[PDB]
Write an enzyme that holds these catalytic residues in place. Structure first.
Site, PDB file in Angstrom:
ATOM      1  N   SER A 270     -45.271 -20.490   9.685  1.00 30.40           N
ATOM      2  CA  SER A 270     -46.357 -20.255   8.742  1.00 30.40           C
ATOM      3  C   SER A 270     -47.201 -19.068   9.203  1.00 30.40           C
ATOM      4  O   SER A 270     -47.657 -18.316   8.398  1.00 30.40           O
ATOM      5  CB  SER A 270     -47.208 -21.489   8.549  1.00 30.40           C
TER       6      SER A 270
ATOM      7  N   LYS B 268     -36.218 -19.692  13.363  1.00 31.90           N
ATOM      8  CA  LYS B 268     -37.601 -19.795  12.939  1.00 31.90           C
ATOM      9  C   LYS B 268     -38.200 -18.398  12.975  1.00 31.90           C
ATOM     10  O   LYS B 268     -38.809 -17.981  13.970  1.00 31.90           O
ATOM     11  CB  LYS B 268     -38.316 -20.807  13.821  1.00 31.90           C
TER      12      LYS B 268
ATOM     13  N   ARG C 191     -50.115 -25.415  11.530  1.00 38.70           N
ATOM     14  CA  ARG C 191     -51.445 -25.389  10.891  1.00 38.70           C
ATOM     15  C   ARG C 191     -51.271 -25.636   9.380  1.00 38.70           C
ATOM     16  O   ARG C 191     -52.009 -26.404   8.796  1.00 38.70           O
ATOM     17  CB  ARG C 191     -52.169 -24.071  11.244  1.00 38.70           C
TER      18      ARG C 191
ATOM     19  N   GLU D 289     -36.845 -18.525  17.759  1.00 41.97           N
ATOM     20  CA  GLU D 289     -38.096 -18.078  17.111  1.00 41.97           C
ATOM     21  C   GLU D 289     -38.532 -16.683  17.562  1.00 41.97           C
ATOM     22  O   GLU D 289     -39.286 -16.577  18.524  1.00 41.97           O
ATOM     23  CB  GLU D 289     -39.230 -19.047  17.443  1.00 41.97           C
TER      24      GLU D 289
END
Lengths: 337, 337, 337, 337
Positions: free
Chosen positions: B263, B222, B295, B180
């Site tokens: 997101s 990610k 979220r 990520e």
């Protein structure tokens, strides 16, 4: 014809073809499962049928390999030992419950033991009750044979148009129809014959489905693999794959989301290996190639289980082995066990 | 470097990218989840954190949309109201349990508030305990910013090689590493700038992973989607899709099985719409384009739930809505609510 | 039925669908080209027909955009100004020469101006001579109309089975048959009607081809795009593309290598834009989507040319414009002029 | 860096990777072609080099199998026997002319016979002249060897960054750069070693190209296939294919449109067979897998052509055999000759 269930049919049919998943056919009638239970010295009472289906469905690890489980009407309303309805057990795990809706076959006069499949009478009302009970797909099996003059034009016509009509009724009532035109392996014909007959029969079935205005995107196909006859020399998975995929490319519209092969008397290992080879073939395949296996998923589990309860953990390990192997086969990633 | 877990890493990483599935990021620390619980008038005690994660994980219909759930260490060892360890709850549904393993960020001397991520110390032994507790993937977040001189060579280098080393350790201990490298949206830059920075950063990360001999087929990415900065006009999903996929095509090897977008600042609906548009782009995409949302998956569920138990059925309906929508987005088949 | 030409048929049919290439329909009879020549004040003598076909075929840059050129029998045996046979001119550039083999249409008694296509008599011997002259594909046009009661079962049946029989004869003699069931755009029907009729017609045609044991892998399809009727409001390329590709997915086997759309009264630009949109659609398309255009490729060239030889360089630049645009359209890369 | 040639670069690079087409490498220097001509008792004069390249380029049927032909500077300005400039001969047939622009290799001090490639000086002005002469792609060969300590960090670094800088200059002047990092086969290493070295080298090259802001969509890769070393047992095409495609999946971005393999030490038939097997592998391949062959395209043609002109028709039939075979190999459709 646009159903009110059109979106759900298209979503569910595509779901069944999810890479890594296939269908367990556990829909054997009270008689058929009798035979299976007999073949391992168990009485055919509702006690044992429930016990066997519970064994399968509560196998640790099995359900994740399954996009669907075909049930018989009895099993659709049955609960497990702890009061859990099987259909809830299935849903919790992301498995669509399916329902066998044909009422078996009858012989066609003026043919050589060719059959047509019954079951259209009151089928709409059945499908609606089945949908309300949690079913989201259906099964109807048509049976064709290979012979000198088989399958006949009459057999083909009857079975194709019986499948088409069944398909419409299913879709009107929110059940994805699995269209199953099984060409029996029985005989000493070669794979080329099987290919030609499979191509002719599928082309007849898609013509019928078009005439009946079926939403192809809301259907499934459960065909035989293209194989030599049961009395002919077995052939490598790559040969099965080449002939089978070629037949499907020639006949099955891209609109159909998934093709869930029947095993038809192939061994557990052979069915898996043949499916795997199809998923390793570099060629245009606009549908998921998956499994809808009964005997090829249960045979070794039935035997390990035998009768009673020390052999449940052992039989569940056996069932997991085949579920996992077929799941890998859908991804072309089965290496042997 | 060959891991003894190599086959399982490759199978699990491929599994996460299953069409129709994505990841729920439920890995927010004891403090971060505090904020979320506060924001809807709930005390941050282990009672409630368990209740919230249970609400999510026992939502009828939700788990089938999920290939994985990222957990915080606490949640990895927690059980539900009926004694089911969450990791078993997840597995029964075919969901891989994942574990956040980074220990947060520190500021780099000589930069303008750029960070590097901590967590390498004793990471091997942690990963092994996590594997034994049922975790099969891991998460580590690197944070980069966009500025006149950012991200700096030093920030990039530190974050890429921190990710690479984390990735190897993960794989040695049987955890698929989610790589990520989040590029924060903060600023007045346009989408073109975001694209260029995302391309630079990903190229640095895959170079580092190559230098560290990471098995790419046993990893996940990610990344941020490519978007305008926080102060700039928002742009249509088709524009997000074009820039994002172009960035990935330029940098992420085909060996990587799946890209699970974060997101970031995006709303529930916007995240879904952007993901969907990526799956509607006809262009070479040799990886699954899926989701790893926090979220964007929980926000509306958190609110409906509020505090207590009449709003569980309603909040679970809300969570299912977002799970179903994102699942459809992975297939390019999301039509709107 | 196995042809001795089977391998060459399969190779040539696949070749026609090469991305970046399509077919020029230059097969207008001595009368039809008369009309075209008249429409720009040129006498219909062999002098001018040769001059026009030479103009097209010696356009710098054009032939590379063309996998095939459909000829009329005259042109198949004609030479250019310098004694170069057109068929050699075509071959040098990698263009397959094709031959129109139908003998036009006749009205069906008991219908409302529906037609059947003639040309089966002595077709085998024609195809053999055409193959010897360098032709490698054939064209036969069936015409269906849309009305209250059209197309009728009789029209469909006659045109489907006429196409199928034409297809086998072609393949026996080494010519890839272009199967062209044109549904005329004429009328005020909507695109949904066109879709339904196109789906029924193609399904009838592939059923016929199966009954006639045609090698699908050695054929081509030249269908109408799915459009509103000529008297209905025009719609965007993306709407044409959605309906068209859906109809093909529902009916045309994956075995068919390529679909070469007819323009059917669309403008040059509109035909290109519609084709482009089909190649930008993210959806299962197990065939090449290309062009077989006549007027949509020649219209603006005919006009620039007029009659005289100062306007050859200018008319050839015009022809190149459309060849290049359609080539880009096959790749989904046409951005507009 | 945005080139003014950006659209043309992307269109030409994509064109080279057209299914059914590949590159003829006819770019052998005055010395290298000397060797080839010697090996069949022909003097190395410009007379004969022209004759040989003319033989190739005027082969009936050959050019349609070719998206490009790499030329040596001499050949770029040469005309055929009849006054046709080769570059026009190529263009008429839709073949892009290419130009070798490197000035050969030199040894790196402090290494064991490792080299770096020269040619950056005045390369911009050369590329512009070459573009004006009709060239639309370029070639630069880097050479790496495999040993206990080879390739070294220094050799890799020098070759990767030499390629990157070459690539930029190419793109600034409207030539698609073929990036050729050839790993020589010499030694007793196995295919696994070749795979590891190819993966390290390509990862270094794409890192360099990123640092140099190269437009990947306007480039090509000409790598070695992954094979056992020259002293090790040869291995089946399926094994070459698996190792080669895996190496490319691990390193070459999807943005690159095509990978045009060098033949290196391989025979004509072996090169074709290995390429074919790569196109029969069912796996994510986000680039065309094609050919850029020298010896593997010319060897048997060189021999059939003794030197004299009675053997031209026979040698041209031999050249067509290899062109046709490699074209089929790009489609995965080569069955043997």
């Amino acid at each position: 014809f646009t159903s009110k269930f059109a979106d759900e049919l298209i979503a569910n049919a595509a779901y069944i073809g999810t890479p890594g998943k296939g269908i367990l056919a556990a829909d054997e009638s009270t008689g058929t499962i009798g035979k299976r239970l007999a073949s391992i010295n168990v009485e055919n009472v509702e006690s044992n049928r429930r016990a066997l289906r519970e064994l399968l469905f509560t196998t640790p690890g099995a359900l994740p390999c399954l996009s669907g489980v075909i049930l018989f009407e009895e099993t659709l309303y049955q609960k497990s030992s702890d009061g859990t309805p099987f259909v809830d057990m299935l849903k919790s795990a992301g498995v669509l419950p399916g329902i066998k809706v044909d009422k078996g076959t009858v012989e066609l006069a003026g043919t050589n033991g060719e059959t047509t499949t019954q079951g259209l009478d009151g089928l709409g009302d059945r499908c609606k009750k089945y949908y309300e009970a949690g079913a989201r797909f259906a099964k109807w099996r048509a049976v064709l044979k290979i012979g000198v003059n088989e399958p006949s034009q009459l057999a083909i016509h009857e079975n194709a148009y019986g499948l088409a009509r069944y398909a419409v009724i299913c879709q009107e009532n929110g059940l994805v129809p699995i269209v199953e035109p099984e060409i029996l392996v029985d005989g000493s014909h070669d794979i080329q014959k099987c290919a030609a007959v499979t191509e002719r029969v599928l082309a007849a079935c898609y013509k019928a489905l078009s005439d009946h205005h079926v939403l192809l995107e809301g259907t499934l196909l459960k065909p035989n693999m293209v194989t030599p006859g049961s009395e002919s020399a077995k052939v490598a998975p790559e040969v099965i794959a080449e002939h089978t995929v070629r037949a499907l490319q020639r006949t099955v519209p891209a609109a159909v989301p998934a093709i869930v092969f029947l095993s038809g008397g192939q061994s557990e290992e052979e069915a898996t290996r043949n499916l795997n080879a199809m998923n390793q073939l570099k060629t245009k395949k606009p549908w998921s190639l998956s499994f809808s296996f009964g005997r090829a998923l249960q045979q070794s589990t039935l035997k390990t289980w035998g009768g009673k309860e020390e052999n449940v953990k052992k039989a569940q390990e056996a069932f997991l082995v085949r579920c996992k192997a077929n799941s890998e086969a859908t991804l072309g990633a089965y290496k042997g066990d």
